[PDB]
Every structure is written in C-alpha cells, then in structure tokens.
C-alpha cells in the first residue's frame, strides 16, 4: 500500500 | 556518538528534502 | 548505511524537475534548520481515550507524510506482532517522514496501552482514471463508537474522531472523501481486532474480510461491514 490516497 | 551527529545531519537533511518536494 | 543513502538521493535527482541541483544545495548546505525530534505522548489515568488518540494523531503527524520518494521503515506485512512493535520504536527513535503503513504500524504501538480501545487496519482499493490506489487507516472503536487514525496525502483520508455509530457509516464516510476527488472505492479490506500484548507471536490478519463494493451492491455492503463488526465482539 504506497499510494496513500 | 559519531554515529549520532550523522543520524542527525541525515535527518535534517532528510526534512529539507521533504519540504522541496512538497 | 551509504548505499541506501545515495540511492535516495539518485531517485530524487530522476523524479524531481531539477533533480540534480536540489541535492546539491542541501548536502552542501553547512546550516541547515534542525528539526526538533518529537516527544512521543504518554499519558495520564485521568486522561480520556479520545484525547489521547487526537495526541497519538497529532503525533503521527509531526512525523510529516514521506515525499522524499524512499520509505526508511519497510514492513512485512507477515511479521509477527512483536516484530513490528520493534519496528514501531524504531520509528519512534529515528523520527523520520513515513506513510500510511507505517502510521498503522505507529498506531498499535501507540495505542497497546488502551485495552478498552479496539484496533483494526481498513485498507482501502480505489480507480482513477485508468490508474488503482491502495491505502490504509487503523480502524479504532471506543465505547460502541468507531473512529480512524492514519497518514495520507489528503485531509479527509485519515483522522475520523470516534464520533460514527455504526462501522458502515465510518467506511461510507471514506468513500464520499474517495468520491469528492473522482475516485470509485473497488474493494476493502478489514482485519480482525489486534492484540494489545506487543510481544504476540501473531501476525495481524489483515483480511479477515474483502468485500467488492461493486458486486455487493449497497445495502449488501451494509449487511457486510455489520458482520465483520459482529464479528470483532469475539
């Protein structure tokens, strides 16, 4: 999960 | 502590780094 | 630790417009701003358990989201609980950016102390625009009611006070934050409540449920969410 939005 | 006067220029560096890329 | 030092800095000069001379007026700046290392709270008895989540948040924040391009904390997501508690203080002791993994990972750490308190991670699959997006949050539930603490590039996509009665309004709420910047929630995933020992030999389980928000259906999605609910009062 690297997106954080 | 020569490892600590380096963990701390790293991280000031670290944060002048983060603030240009924002 | 000089190979990944220079790694950052090689991935900054290829992402950034002016790559190059970006690095070279900050490794060759002798006066640079020291940053303050933050404090990490502890508490009183007498203190609320929301006032101490909005100081754990506030904390998460000091941190600063990582922009830098390079993650300095990286996780496994298989490790056991005590595995990443060692994690967590690191962080703790580094003080450096992170992001939103990691400040679920801070989150435990931080909150093991409140065994009134209950934690789980929701992670979240979004489209936009041909491209998918993966985020995460810590579900938290304090006395009936449900809350979010977390790090993310946008305001409405971490902190929810423990305010929402029921868990589908809580993740009915992230999905209108999803929709107001054009981007369709695919799929959730949400993880069993985690131990409070942070010396537990388990790993989290992060997907004791994974619902498809598009081949549910609305009030079937409600349905859903209430049983995984349900099924953390176990």
């Given amino acids: 999960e690297g997106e954080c939005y | 502590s020569a490892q600590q006067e380096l963990k701390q220029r790293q991280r000031a560096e670290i944060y002048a780094l983060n603030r240009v890329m924002t | ?39 990490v709270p502890t508490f009183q008895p007498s203190t609320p358990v929301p006032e101490r989540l909005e100081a754990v948040q506030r904390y998460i924040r000091e941190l600063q989201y990582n922009h830098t391009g390079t993650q300095f904390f990286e996780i496994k997501k298989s490790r056991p609980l005590t595995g990443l508690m060692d994690l967590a203080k690191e962080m703790t002791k580094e003080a450096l950016p992170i992001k939103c993994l990691e400040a679920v990972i801070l989150g435990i750490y931080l909150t093991n102390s409140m065994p009134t308190l209950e934690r789980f991670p929701i992670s979240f699959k979004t489209y936009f625009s041909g491209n998918y997006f993966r985020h995460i ?14 790090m993310s590039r946008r305001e409405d996509l971490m902190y929810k ?38 010396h537990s030999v388990e790993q989290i389980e992060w997907k004791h449920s994974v619902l498809d928000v598009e081949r549910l259906g609305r009030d079937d999605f409600r349905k ?8 953390m009062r176990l």
């Fill in chain 3, 137 to 150: 949050v810590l579900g938290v539930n304090f006395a009936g009611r449900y809350g979010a603490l977390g």
């Fill in chain 3, 1 to 39: 630790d000089e190979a990944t030092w220079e790694r950052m800095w090689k991935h900054v000069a290829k992402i950034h417009p002016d790559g190059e001379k970006v690095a070279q007026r900050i490794r060759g700046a002798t006066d640079l701003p020291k940053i303050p290392i933050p404090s």
């Fill in chain 3, 161 to 198: 006070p423990p305010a929402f009665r029921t868990l589908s309004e809580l993740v009915l709420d992230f999905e209108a934050a999803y929709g107001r910047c054009w981007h369709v929630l695919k799929k959730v995933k949400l993880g069993q409540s985690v131990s409070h020992d942070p």
């Fill in chain 3, 224 to 231: 859903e969410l209430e049983r995984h609910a349900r099924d």
